[model samples]
Target chain A: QRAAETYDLLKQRTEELRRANAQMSLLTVLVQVTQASNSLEAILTPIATAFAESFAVNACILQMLEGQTLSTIQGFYSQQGTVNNWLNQDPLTNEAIATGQIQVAANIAKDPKLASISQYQDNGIQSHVVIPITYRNEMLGVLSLQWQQPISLREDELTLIHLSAQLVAIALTSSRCS
Target chain B: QRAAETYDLLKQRTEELRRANAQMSLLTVLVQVTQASNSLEAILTPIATAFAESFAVNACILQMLEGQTLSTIQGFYSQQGTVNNWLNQDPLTNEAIATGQIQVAANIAKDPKLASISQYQDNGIQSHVVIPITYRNEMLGVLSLQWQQPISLREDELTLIHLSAQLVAIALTSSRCS
Candidate 1:
């Protein structure tokens, strides 16, 4: 039993190390993407595309908060070309905007905070992570990832998503100011 | 023995978590600093100040590469609230500029790359981390952190400094473009 438990512990450590390397790699690519682009679309397209493929998510959206509404600035869909806007009043995005924190809906069909929203159901998104992209106290927008299957994101994955949101926040906000 | 090994593993995990949290916090502050100002000095002041305080470094300098030399734009010193600029030809700043990488001198008196530099030893600087700021293959400048004792930075800490350099790179480059 001890040996088996030890094996499991080692396995977990290896997984953590792998995840850390992935996060580092993502950050490196993210910085490069920002550096190589001059336009908002040019900047976010590669990022949104990479996030979907890197994390094995079905869809990803890079949105910008204009006034009180959020508009999809760049999006990548595994199924192709579907996009939608989110309002400040939307149930799924309200908490993220209010607290400037990552909001996760694992098994959206059963999540009270998101289950009532027809958007997820209509789009067949069973799980998703919504990360608010903010600079200072100002809300810039969000980077949201969706999975068709019910999924519980690991802590490391959430952290990666959160950091990616930050990278996006810095680039987007700086682009606007410039 | 098994239990002790497990405890050790858990302890290491906890340390990693703590460090990750610290890095996340630094990025949060960096984004805020960039958002709060449009000028290069205004953007980098808080970052330089935070680096000295948060990392327990004796001094921090933020520089920009102009023409063929690096110029100090802002700095924070624990001993005195004063700043100074170092030229590209200066022994301490040369390697980082030439290699376009993070340069470390664990002991200025002993490190071959820095030992010949009398300015550092004369200033009583024993160690430092010099992070080259680059974006899209363009060298912007460097972020230097100094200590009074020999110090070898951990990988995670260096990663934080590297990411911070990228943040400064984007902001600095964008400001110029605008």
Candidate 2:
């Protein structure tokens, strides 16, 4: 019985280690992209790439900062067949990004608000999360990550991504201000 | 014999691929700079940083080498803005300005003429690449790339810098003209 208990503990510890490693990988990606943020494209592409890779995602889209709306800056679809097949037509209100609030849709096809978004249907992004890249309550942009899995991101996972978004904000500002 | 020759050809092809990627990156950065030209700081910060990073430099400075004498206009600096403060002293001679040749010093410390320049000693800048921006043979300005890290800026790298400087100068002139 003791051996079995120890084995269970080992399994749990291994899972925790994997989780930490994944978070670190995401943070490193954020830092690297932020450090190279003198050029706008340099900064955004990496953040979007990180978002896509972090969750085995398909589409990663960014919208520019409008007064209260987001204009699509760039969108990447991973599937070779569906890349650039849909138009990006969503805008985030100031209320979302400034709060660093988490917006998660377990099954985008079933989500009433997203059901009519054509890109979601065409791209097969059933599950998704939105994290506002903000600093001092000022919204620079919106980062959306789309995945095919019904992914329920844990608090720690959300925290890690939120922090990444902060780093992205710094990167964006550094490039813009410099 | 053909197979052996193919190996050399492949190596050359790989080098060309790398150059092509660098050119694409440079072009993207130049386009971003052009968009941000109205904001002078926005334009110069990226240009200076890109030049330094691309060339593996630790320190880089861009200055306008204009006028007939002791009239150096320090435009931008990479590491610190200290170099910009020192640009007031050297004005280009008409003959030097007329020649419109790039002035490069692989090692400023070893150059007896430049050894006493405290700016280099203070910033630990050693190698320098200076390019005069003259598009269509009309002298616009000068771009001076300096490095705290030992670096040899390549021919293509200089070509990219010259093109960027030309864009910057033309933009500045047009803005002033309007």
Candidate 3:
């Protein structure tokens, strides 16, 4: 029967709908929290957490690019619901910035480059989707989405991810304007 | 063969994906336009056009509420590709703000209350979905989506509309912060 096809599409769409709601809520939450204090970290840390919570990912990290080189990691969110302020380097994020394109480590455990990172190794994050934060054809930084297990992503979800990164750029720009 | 059902759901999900992309781009575009200056209209006028263009609606109008009453229509976008600054009150928008909820006129031509409105009559806009823009349990304004002919909306789309409105509030709030 054709039931299975219909069922698959239905389940996929349900997840899409949930992510869509989460995307909208993330920015809404960011605006409210940003009302009082305006800081670079203030802008990104919450955004990171929103990605982790809304996308159902294990961790989210945002690193800045300044003077044509990647800077330190200032915004981070772990599934344990904590924001780590320490600075570090990430190959996935660095590649995304260096190439100005999305870089994905769909199975981190299989990639020697990512598997060696203790932060990810010990934390059980098994995948990474690093997207460049861009606006007006310029790269601002990178948004990294981490998962607890390897998974496949649809093209539609990738479109949504790129668009979501654009929103992050706007929010960061607003912080600068203020 | 169950072909029709599968076809219908596929078409619907495709449309949903398009709208999701548009929703993300709307905020992205808003930030770009708002970078130069800060104004209430500046925050919303572009938003109106993006909604109209992205949602494929005939027009989008945003009216603000002040001192517990609708003030004026500062943000306006029509498919004709123009911004109208002059203000006028609309029954649907008024009801949305008054009741603090969404109000729909699925068929304007059939509703006597809306039928006589020359603007709708002349523009050939036969349907409307007016959504109240609320954040933090307070109403800020209403977002009006207009169509050239009657149509039915999925509850999922309405959820997207409400969440989109919340984003509008954040943008408005961001403008205020600036």
iRMS of candidate 2, Å:
17.6
The 0-to-1 C-alpha lDDT of every candidate, in the order given, reads 0.71, 0.57, 0.70
Clashing pairs in 3: none
**Docking quality tier of model 2:** incorrect
lDDT against true structure, model 3: 0.70
The clash tally of candidate 3 reads 0
What's the lDDT for candidate 1? 0.71
Assess every candidate by TM-score.
Answer: 0.71, 0.46, 0.59
**Top of the candidates by lDDT:** 1
Relative to the true structure, candidate 3 has a C-alpha RMSD (angstroms) of 6.3
Query: In candidate 3, how many Å is residue A142 off?
Result: 6.6
Q: Could you list the chain B TM-scores for each candidate?
A: 0.85, 0.69, 0.76
| Higher-ranked by DockQ: 1 or 3 | 1
Ranking by lDDT: 1, 3, 2
Alpha-carbon shift of residue A161 in model 1 (angstroms):
5.9
For model 2, the local distance difference test gives 0.57
Provide the lowest-lDDT 10-residue window in model 1 chain B. Answer: B80-89
In order of TM-score, best first, we have 1, 3, 2
Residue pairs in candidate 1 whose N, alpha carbon or C atoms collide under 3 angstroms: none
Candidate DockQ scores, in order: 0.28, 0.02, 0.18
